[PDB]
Design an enzyme around this catalytic site. Structure first.
Site, PDB file in Angstrom:
ATOM      1  N   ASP A 121       0.840  -1.216   0.000  1.00 33.91           N
ATOM      2  CA  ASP A 121       0.000   0.000   0.000  1.00 33.91           C
ATOM      3  C   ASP A 121       0.880   1.273   0.000  1.00 33.91           C
ATOM      4  N   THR A 159      -7.051   3.482  -2.205  1.00 32.25           N
ATOM      5  CA  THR A 159      -6.707   2.112  -1.925  1.00 32.25           C
ATOM      6  C   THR A 159      -7.699   1.089  -2.473  1.00 32.25           C
ATOM      7  N   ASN A 180     -12.966   5.538  -1.713  1.00 28.70           N
ATOM      8  CA  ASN A 180     -12.970   4.976  -0.360  1.00 28.70           C
ATOM      9  C   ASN A 180     -14.282   5.215   0.397  1.00 28.70           C
ATOM     10  N   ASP A 261       2.114   2.992   3.098  1.00 29.02           N
ATOM     11  CA  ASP A 261       1.047   3.967   3.129  1.00 29.02           C
ATOM     12  C   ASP A 261       0.825   4.563   4.532  1.00 29.02           C
ATOM     13  N   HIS A 420      -3.055  10.706  -0.957  1.00 28.41           N
ATOM     14  CA  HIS A 420      -3.084  10.266  -2.370  1.00 28.41           C
ATOM     15  C   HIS A 420      -4.542  10.320  -2.776  1.00 28.41           C
ATOM     16  N   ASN A 685     -24.083   9.240 -23.444  1.00 20.11           N
ATOM     17  CA  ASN A 685     -24.389   8.563 -22.162  1.00 20.11           C
ATOM     18  C   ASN A 685     -23.105   8.277 -21.356  1.00 20.11           C
ATOM     19  N   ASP A 687     -20.407   6.519 -21.415  1.00 18.54           N
ATOM     20  CA  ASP A 687     -20.027   5.146 -21.044  1.00 18.54           C
ATOM     21  C   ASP A 687     -18.673   4.745 -21.629  1.00 18.54           C
ATOM     22  N   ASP A 691     -21.607   5.876 -29.381  1.00 18.58           N
ATOM     23  CA  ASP A 691     -23.069   5.930 -29.421  1.00 18.58           C
ATOM     24  C   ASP A 691     -23.631   5.395 -30.717  1.00 18.58           C
TER      25      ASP A 691
HETATM   26  C1  LIG Z   1     -14.704  -2.144 -19.382  1.00 18.14           C
HETATM   27  O1  LIG Z   1     -14.992  -3.537 -19.402  1.00 18.14           O
HETATM   28  C2  LIG Z   1     -16.317  -3.886 -18.955  1.00 18.14           C
HETATM   29  C3  LIG Z   1     -16.534  -5.406 -18.888  1.00 18.14           C
HETATM   30  O2  LIG Z   1     -16.507  -5.891 -20.217  1.00 18.14           O
HETATM   31  C4  LIG Z   1     -17.366  -3.253 -19.882  1.00 18.14           C
HETATM   32  O3  LIG Z   1     -18.600  -3.267 -19.200  1.00 18.14           O
HETATM   33  C5  LIG Z   1     -19.614  -4.072 -19.821  1.00 18.14           C
HETATM   34  O4  LIG Z   1     -20.271  -3.355 -20.853  1.00 18.14           O
HETATM   35  C6  LIG Z   1     -21.409  -3.961 -21.462  1.00 18.14           C
HETATM   36  C7  LIG Z   1     -22.088  -2.963 -22.420  1.00 18.14           C
HETATM   37  O5  LIG Z   1     -22.444  -1.773 -21.718  1.00 18.14           O
HETATM   38  C8  LIG Z   1     -22.427  -4.432 -20.404  1.00 18.14           C
HETATM   39  O6  LIG Z   1     -23.409  -5.227 -21.058  1.00 18.14           O
HETATM   40  C9  LIG Z   1     -24.740  -4.978 -20.515  1.00 18.14           C
HETATM   41  O7  LIG Z   1     -24.991  -5.808 -19.380  1.00 18.14           O
HETATM   42  C10 LIG Z   1     -26.316  -6.019 -18.894  1.00 18.14           C
HETATM   43  C11 LIG Z   1     -26.277  -7.212 -17.940  1.00 18.14           C
HETATM   44  O8  LIG Z   1     -25.344  -6.839 -16.956  1.00 18.14           O
HETATM   45  C12 LIG Z   1     -25.324  -7.678 -15.783  1.00 18.14           C
HETATM   46  O9  LIG Z   1     -24.583  -8.888 -15.930  1.00 18.14           O
HETATM   47  C13 LIG Z   1     -23.171  -8.755 -16.102  1.00 18.14           C
HETATM   48  C14 LIG Z   1     -22.543 -10.119 -16.409  1.00 18.14           C
HETATM   49  O10 LIG Z   1     -22.649 -11.007 -15.318  1.00 18.14           O
HETATM   50  C15 LIG Z   1     -22.561  -8.030 -14.887  1.00 18.14           C
HETATM   51  O11 LIG Z   1     -21.151  -7.912 -14.982  1.00 18.14           O
HETATM   52  C16 LIG Z   1     -23.233  -6.652 -14.756  1.00 18.14           C
HETATM   53  O12 LIG Z   1     -22.665  -5.917 -13.680  1.00 18.14           O
HETATM   54  C17 LIG Z   1     -23.007  -4.507 -13.682  1.00 18.14           C
HETATM   55  O13 LIG Z   1     -24.162  -4.177 -12.922  1.00 18.14           O
HETATM   56  C18 LIG Z   1     -24.124  -4.667 -11.581  1.00 18.14           C
HETATM   57  C19 LIG Z   1     -25.445  -4.353 -10.888  1.00 18.14           C
HETATM   58  O14 LIG Z   1     -25.850  -3.035 -11.200  1.00 18.14           O
HETATM   59  C20 LIG Z   1     -22.900  -4.139 -10.801  1.00 18.14           C
HETATM   60  O15 LIG Z   1     -22.653  -4.919  -9.643  1.00 18.14           O
HETATM   61  C21 LIG Z   1     -21.610  -4.115 -11.636  1.00 18.14           C
HETATM   62  O16 LIG Z   1     -20.659  -3.276 -10.997  1.00 18.14           O
HETATM   63  C22 LIG Z   1     -21.845  -3.695 -13.102  1.00 18.14           C
HETATM   64  O17 LIG Z   1     -22.178  -2.319 -13.147  1.00 18.14           O
HETATM   65  C23 LIG Z   1     -21.585  -1.591 -14.247  1.00 18.14           C
HETATM   66  O18 LIG Z   1     -22.253  -1.797 -15.494  1.00 18.14           O
HETATM   67  C24 LIG Z   1     -23.610  -1.360 -15.568  1.00 18.14           C
HETATM   68  C25 LIG Z   1     -24.216  -1.745 -16.919  1.00 18.14           C
HETATM   69  O19 LIG Z   1     -24.396  -3.143 -16.995  1.00 18.14           O
HETATM   70  C26 LIG Z   1     -23.677   0.151 -15.312  1.00 18.14           C
HETATM   71  O20 LIG Z   1     -25.022   0.586 -15.306  1.00 18.14           O
HETATM   72  C27 LIG Z   1     -22.965   0.507 -13.995  1.00 18.14           C
HETATM   73  O21 LIG Z   1     -22.776   1.892 -13.912  1.00 18.14           O
HETATM   74  C28 LIG Z   1     -21.570  -0.101 -13.888  1.00 18.14           C
HETATM   75  O22 LIG Z   1     -20.739   0.616 -14.768  1.00 18.14           O
HETATM   76  C29 LIG Z   1     -24.760  -6.832 -14.633  1.00 18.14           C
HETATM   77  O23 LIG Z   1     -25.081  -7.416 -13.387  1.00 18.14           O
HETATM   78  C30 LIG Z   1     -27.348  -6.234 -20.006  1.00 18.14           C
HETATM   79  O24 LIG Z   1     -28.633  -6.228 -19.424  1.00 18.14           O
HETATM   80  C31 LIG Z   1     -27.215  -5.169 -21.106  1.00 18.14           C
HETATM   81  O25 LIG Z   1     -28.118  -5.469 -22.157  1.00 18.14           O
HETATM   82  C32 LIG Z   1     -28.919  -4.361 -22.659  1.00 18.14           C
HETATM   83  O26 LIG Z   1     -28.390  -3.759 -23.840  1.00 18.14           O
HETATM   84  C33 LIG Z   1     -28.190  -4.716 -24.896  1.00 18.14           C
HETATM   85  C34 LIG Z   1     -27.346  -4.184 -26.060  1.00 18.14           C
HETATM   86  O27 LIG Z   1     -26.711  -5.292 -26.672  1.00 18.14           O
HETATM   87  C35 LIG Z   1     -29.517  -5.329 -25.379  1.00 18.14           C
HETATM   88  O28 LIG Z   1     -29.281  -6.378 -26.306  1.00 18.14           O
HETATM   89  C36 LIG Z   1     -30.307  -5.873 -24.184  1.00 18.14           C
HETATM   90  O29 LIG Z   1     -31.610  -6.202 -24.612  1.00 18.14           O
HETATM   91  C37 LIG Z   1     -30.329  -4.893 -22.989  1.00 18.14           C
HETATM   92  O30 LIG Z   1     -31.222  -3.821 -23.245  1.00 18.14           O
HETATM   93  C38 LIG Z   1     -32.187  -3.766 -22.173  1.00 18.14           C
HETATM   94  O31 LIG Z   1     -31.753  -2.992 -21.057  1.00 18.14           O
HETATM   95  C39 LIG Z   1     -31.599  -1.596 -21.304  1.00 18.14           C
HETATM   96  C40 LIG Z   1     -31.031  -0.910 -20.056  1.00 18.14           C
HETATM   97  O32 LIG Z   1     -31.714  -1.332 -18.889  1.00 18.14           O
HETATM   98  C41 LIG Z   1     -32.927  -0.980 -21.785  1.00 18.14           C
HETATM   99  O33 LIG Z   1     -32.749   0.359 -22.189  1.00 18.14           O
HETATM  100  C42 LIG Z   1     -33.519  -1.771 -22.961  1.00 18.14           C
HETATM  101  O34 LIG Z   1     -34.790  -1.241 -23.307  1.00 18.14           O
HETATM  102  C43 LIG Z   1     -33.553  -3.287 -22.676  1.00 18.14           C
HETATM  103  O35 LIG Z   1     -34.515  -3.627 -21.697  1.00 18.14           O
HETATM  104  C44 LIG Z   1     -25.771  -5.160 -21.637  1.00 18.14           C
HETATM  105  O36 LIG Z   1     -25.466  -6.363 -22.322  1.00 18.14           O
HETATM  106  C45 LIG Z   1     -21.761  -5.189 -19.238  1.00 18.14           C
HETATM  107  O37 LIG Z   1     -22.679  -5.398 -18.179  1.00 18.14           O
HETATM  108  C46 LIG Z   1     -20.572  -4.412 -18.681  1.00 18.14           C
HETATM  109  N1  LIG Z   1     -19.879  -5.198 -17.661  1.00 18.14           N
HETATM  110  C47 LIG Z   1     -19.401  -4.748 -16.488  1.00 18.14           C
HETATM  111  C48 LIG Z   1     -18.705  -5.749 -15.574  1.00 18.14           C
HETATM  112  O38 LIG Z   1     -19.482  -3.578 -16.116  1.00 18.14           O
HETATM  113  C49 LIG Z   1     -17.043  -1.778 -20.119  1.00 18.14           C
HETATM  114  O39 LIG Z   1     -17.866  -1.329 -21.181  1.00 18.14           O
HETATM  115  C50 LIG Z   1     -15.571  -1.515 -20.448  1.00 18.14           C
HETATM  116  N2  LIG Z   1     -15.320  -0.096 -20.483  1.00 18.14           N
HETATM  117  C51 LIG Z   1     -14.767   0.528 -21.542  1.00 18.14           C
HETATM  118  C52 LIG Z   1     -14.583   2.024 -21.465  1.00 18.14           C
HETATM  119  O40 LIG Z   1     -14.417  -0.063 -22.540  1.00 18.14           O
HETATM  120 CA    CA Z   2     -21.766   5.972 -25.400  1.00 16.74          CA
HETATM  121 CL    CL Z   3     -13.045   8.786  -2.050  1.00 18.97          CL
HETATM  122 ZN    ZN Z   4      -3.549   5.812   2.169  1.00 16.45          ZN
END
Ligand SMILES: *[C@@H]1O[C@H](CO)[C@@H](O[C@@H]2O[C@H](CO)[C@@H](O[C@@H]3O[C@H](CO[C@H]4O[C@H](CO)[C@@H](O)[C@H](O[C@H]5O[C@H](CO)[C@@H](O)[C@H](O)[C@@H]5O[C@H]5O[C@H](CO)[C@@H](O)[C@H](O)[C@@H]5O)[C@@H]4O)[C@@H](O)[C@H](O[C@H]4O[C@H](CO)[C@@H](O)[C@H](O)[C@@H]4O[C@H]4O[C@H](CO)[C@@H](O)[C@H](O)[C@@H]4O)[C@@H]3O)[C@H](O)[C@H]2NC(C)=O)[C@H](O)[C@H]1NC(C)=O
Ligand code: CA
Ligand code: CL
Ligand code: ZN
Ligand code: YLU
Ligand code: CA
Ligand code: NA
EC number: 3.1.4.39
Length: 806
Positions: A121, A159, A180, A261, A420, A685, A687, A691
């Site tokens: 750390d 951290t 944190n 740390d 940090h 959005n 992300d 888009d």
């Molecule tokens: C960095 O790498 C990561 C990992 O690869 C990239 O993130 C992925 O991006 C994908 C595209 O955005 C995304 O895919 C979506 O996932 C949905 C299912 O997600 C659940 O299951 C997965 C797999 O087990 C899980 O990992 C997810 O975890 C997220 O959410 C939980 C609970 O909230 C959190 O604990 C976790 O931290 C994580 O949150 C993060 O991601 C979510 C988005 O999923 C954000 O909202 C958070 O802020 C946070 O960043 C989930 O538990 C799935 O449902 C989506 O499908 C929709 O869209 C597709 C398009 O193909 C469509 O076909 C479907 O029908 C569906 O549409 C429907 O839902 C819409 C929204 O509700 C709605 O508008 C429509 O009308 C439809 O009803 C989609 O497939 C994937 O989940 C994440 N993975 C992770 C781990 O984050 C990331 O992009 C990379 N970053 C860069 C810059 O490159």
């Molecule tokens: Ca976007």
């Molecule tokens: Cl913080």
């Molecule tokens: Zn510290």
């Protein structure tokens, strides 16, 4: 409720968590107040300390001692780590010459070299050089293994965000540990360092390495050590686990140190009190390496020595107070310190307005040490926006400073001298990486890289398939002797059209004009060649970018530049051109000031129009290939084609014009030619991903011309700058940026001054990796070079940081 009345006998640091609630003896029990009554007694023995002495040699086993010097301790796996040295005439690992480990030298029954993660750390990257005299074990790891000058943490450089990024390969916005401290409005719950809510799994997204391992049948040691468990006991436990039978023994282990740390916060990164924690860490590495040698595992295991973040000089008197800026101070909640996050104190208050809060914090004092941002306006390299736990309003705090709400918060909460959390490009926040083992290279220095990349490598080291993550798998193949991942290029999804002349001028009704009706088989066969791609080898040096999604687009050729023009978004997705060292900047001739020319290769229905820009009182336009850089007066006409035009706010045109008029030529001069690829980005959005058309929130008034949220440029030249960019025989050098396309220059406090005083500084803040632009555009760059693909992946992950030398 735990009826904690069973026993830890024979179960100390058991790898599986038990029910019925027997009472637990695993690593998490202390945290859950659920250890068996005899946990301390049996599992945390300390009698006689941690080292064998001459008179303990060959003793009779006394189960009370913390570790053993008896003849049978090797079979039991529980000797003190200096046993063979004191009792059997062996040397310490650090005293042995280093010798290349060409293959794993493992005891029978080891199916793969184990991975041991030694995480520290607050271990700032410059400690490797600056503390080298007092860290001989670490220094041998570093010089004999593979090392980077530093490793870049994620933002914020705290951290938990960083440890969990190391565990998952994800940005904090995707894994959910975005600081944190956090509030999750959906859960309506809060997460803090002190407390129990942080143990609820719902905070922790993604799939960390221990889960990836377990799901694929690779057993993992625990990734949690209670603060009270001394370091010597952590090491002895890992060494004990390594002596388990083949079917029970984990393949991946983690050690963690709270130092340096802990002392760094109290004394600052280079306080004289810092020497001792560094000595003590080194001694702990020594104990591990001696222990491994005793088990004949020192040429079998891969060891990673890795930090989460560095440490900066920060004192109480360097605090900015929001009470000096805001009148409504008590209507906000500030997450304070080395970053700020602001939200409404109460959601039943409709008088709360983020725009006025931002305005009150913007450029209000001459030396102001923080900058407010809406989260979507933060530099894209931070990847810090796409999570409901990140407040819409954000303060980037200058290094060496804190922000707080009111003075009472600082003297009723100088104690600390280090902290940090700052921007992850800051030198003081950089941390360390060293890989040592049969799978890592011998005596190799690699370039600095980002900690999001390690998850893939750790998966490679363990033969695991990584879960989806933000690393670029293959970009760190150069760290490894074997076990490399042979990445292949993604397939192009859309092939382009190559339109010829298909339209007459009169078919266009765009409200555009150009003073171009000023008129020969010399210069006419020539211009035809250019329009067919005769100069394309010059302006498109690394192949055309591949389009990785379904769309309709055209390749357009010109003397000075080539473009991929999107019929869907009505503008180029990319424009490619090369400016040699010798190129000349010219001005836009007077008669051509407002010239826009229809492109007879592209239908009126897939073109922009000038009227829309006339009607839109906010929106103007710029060009992707700059007219200033045209190769000849006649070629200049190509730059005013409507297919080279893009929408631009007048405030942004000040930035863009300076980049194109002044900086491109400056880079060409300095780097011996540059190839430039520029284009729009749409990420409404926030992300970090391209888009689709149905996601665009803004259009040029009265048209279907979508407004970009950002403009990118990728600037490539020869790493050996004695070779010109267009004739490079070896590795490339790149810098890139993603500039926010904003209607004001509020971000730059010096913007009323000449562009020479503020633009380059803005561009530096918005430096980017080619890989970031790839995600934002759905394009794949560098498809045709003479380089290996792993090398190109490394180049695509490079970030030009503009910090001085570490
Ligand atoms: C960095 O790498 C990561 C990992 O690869 C990239 O993130 C992925 O991006 C994908 C595209 O955005 C995304 O895919 C979506 O996932 C949905 C299912 O997600 C659940 O299951 C997965 C797999 O087990 C899980 O990992 C997810 O975890 C997220 O959410 C939980 C609970 O909230 C959190 O604990 C976790 O931290 C994580 O949150 C993060 O991601 C979510 C988005 O999923 C954000 O909202 C958070 O802020 C946070 O960043 C989930 O538990 C799935 O449902 C989506 O499908 C929709 O869209 C597709 C398009 O193909 C469509 O076909 C479907 O029908 C569906 O549409 C429907 O839902 C819409 C929204 O509700 C709605 O508008 C429509 O009308 C439809 O009803 C989609 O497939 C994937 O989940 C994440 N993975 C992770 C781990 O984050 C990331 O992009 C990379 N970053 C860069 C810059 O490159
Ligand atoms: Ca976007
Ligand atoms: Cl913080
Ligand atoms: Zn510290
Ligand atoms: C504080 C003790 C921290 C701790 N002790 N031993 N290991 N360990 C640790 C934890 C983590 C983490 O992210 N844990 C999640 C978590 C943390 N805390 C709570 C309460 C719930 N879940 C990651 C690492 C880690 C280091 C380096 C690399 C390359 C990969 C890693 F994975 C280590
Ligand atoms: Ca206008
Ligand atoms: Na300004």
């Amino acid at each position: 409720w735990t009826a904690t009345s069973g026993s830890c006998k024979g179960r100390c640091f058991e790898l599986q968590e038990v029910g019925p609630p027997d009472c637990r003896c695993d690593n998490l029990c202390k945290s859950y107040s659920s250890c068996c009554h005899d946990f301390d007694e049996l599992c945390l023995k300390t009698a006689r300390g941690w080292e064998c002495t001459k008179d303990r040699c060959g003793e009779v086993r006394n189960e009370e001692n913390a570790c053993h010097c008896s003849e049978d301790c090797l079979s039991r796996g529980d000797c003190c780590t200096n046993y063979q040295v004191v009792c059997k005439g062996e040397s310490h690992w650090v005293d042995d010459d280093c010798e290349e480990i060409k293959v794993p030298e493992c005891p029978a029954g080891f199916v793969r070299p184990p991975l041991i993660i030694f995480s520290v750390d607050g271990f700032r990257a410059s400690y490797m050089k600056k503390g080298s005299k007092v860290m001989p074990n670490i220094e041998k790891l570093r010089s004999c293994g593979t090392h980077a000058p530093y490793m870049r943490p994620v933002y914020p450089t705290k951290t938990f965000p960083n440890l969990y990024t190391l565990a998952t390969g994800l940005y904090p916005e995707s894994h959910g540990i975005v600081g944190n401290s956090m509030y999750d409005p959906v859960f309506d719950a809060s997460f803090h360092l002190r407390g129990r809510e942080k143990f609820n799994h719902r905070w922790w997204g993604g799939q960390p390495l221990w889960i990836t391992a377990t799901k694929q049948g690779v057993r993992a040691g625990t990734f949690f050590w209670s603060v009270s468990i001394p370091h010597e006991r952590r090491i002895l436990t890992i060494l004990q686990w390594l002596s388990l039978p083949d079917n029970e023994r984990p393949s991946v282990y983690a050690f963690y140190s709270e130092q340096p740390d802990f002392s760094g916060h109290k004394y600052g990164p280079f306080g004289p009190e810092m020497t001792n924690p560094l000595r003590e860490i080194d001694k702990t590495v020594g104990q591990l390496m001696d222990g491994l040698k005793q088990l004949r595992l020192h040429r079998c295991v891969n060891v990673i020595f890795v930090g989460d973040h560095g440490m900066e000089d920060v004192t109480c008197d360097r605090t900015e107070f929001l009470s000096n800026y805001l009148t409504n101070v008590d209507d906000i909640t500030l997450v304070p310190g080395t970053l700020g996050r602001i939200r409404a104190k109460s959601i039943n208050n409709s008088k709360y307005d983020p725009k006025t809060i931002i305005a009150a914090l913007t450029c209000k004092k001459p030396d102001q040490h923080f900058k407010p941002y809406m989260k979507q306006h933060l530099p894209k390299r931070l990847h810090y926006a796409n999570n409901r736990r990140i407040e819409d309003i954000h303060l980037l705090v200058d290094r060496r400073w804190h922000v707080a709400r009111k003075p009472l918060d600082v003297y009723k909460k100088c104690f600390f001298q280090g902290d940090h959390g700052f921007d992850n490009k800051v030198n003081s926040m950089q941390t360390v990486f060293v890989g040592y083992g049969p799978t890592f290279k011998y005596r190799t220095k690699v370039p600095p890289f980002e900690n999001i990349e390690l998850y893939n490598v750790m998966c490679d080291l363990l033969g695991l398939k990584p879960a989806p993550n933000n690393g670029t798998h293959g970009s760190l193949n150069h760290l490894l002797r074997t076990n490399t991942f042979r990445p292949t290029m993604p397939d192009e999804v859309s092939r382009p059209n190559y339109p010829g002349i298909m339209y007459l001028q009169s078919e266009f009704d765009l409200g555009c004009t150009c003073d171009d009706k000023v008129e020969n088989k010399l210069e006419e066969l020539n211009k035809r060649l250019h329009t067919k791609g005769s100069t394309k080898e010059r302006h498109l040096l690394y192949g055309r970018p591949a389009v990785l999604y379904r769309t309709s687009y055209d390749i357009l050729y010109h003397t000075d530049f080539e473009s991929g023009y999107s019929e869907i978004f009505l503008m180029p997705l990319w424009t490619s051109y090369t400016i040699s060292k010798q190129a000349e900047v010219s001005s836009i001739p007077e008669h051509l000031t407002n010239c826009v020319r229809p492109d007879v290769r592209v239908s009126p229905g897939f073109s922009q129009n000038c009227l829309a820009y006339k009607n839109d009182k906010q929106m103007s336009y710029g060009f992707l290939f700059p007219p200033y850089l045209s190769s000849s007066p006649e070629a200049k006409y190509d730059a005013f084609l409507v297919t080279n035009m893009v929408p631009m706010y007048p405030a942004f045109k000040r930035v863009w014009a300076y980049f194109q008029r002044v900086l491109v030529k400056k880079y060409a001069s300095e780097r011996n030619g540059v190839n430039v690829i520029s284009g729009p980005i749409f990420d409404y959005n926030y992300d970090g991903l391209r888009d689709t058309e149905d996601e665009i929130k803004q259009y040029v008034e009265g048209s279907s011309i979508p407004v970009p949220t950002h403009y990118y440029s990728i600037i490539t030249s020869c790493l050996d700058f004695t070779q010109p960019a267009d004739k490079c025989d070896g590795p490339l050098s790149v810098s890139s940026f993603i500039l926010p396309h904003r209607p004001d220059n509020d971000e730059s406090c010096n913007s009323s001054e000449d562009e020479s005083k503020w633009v380059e500084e803005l561009m530096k803040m918005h430096t980017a990796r080619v890989r970031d632009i790839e995600h934002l555009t759905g394009l794949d760059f560098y498809r045709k070079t003479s380089r290996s693909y792993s090398e190109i992946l490394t180049l695509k992950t490079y970030l030009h940081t503009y910090e001085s030398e570490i």
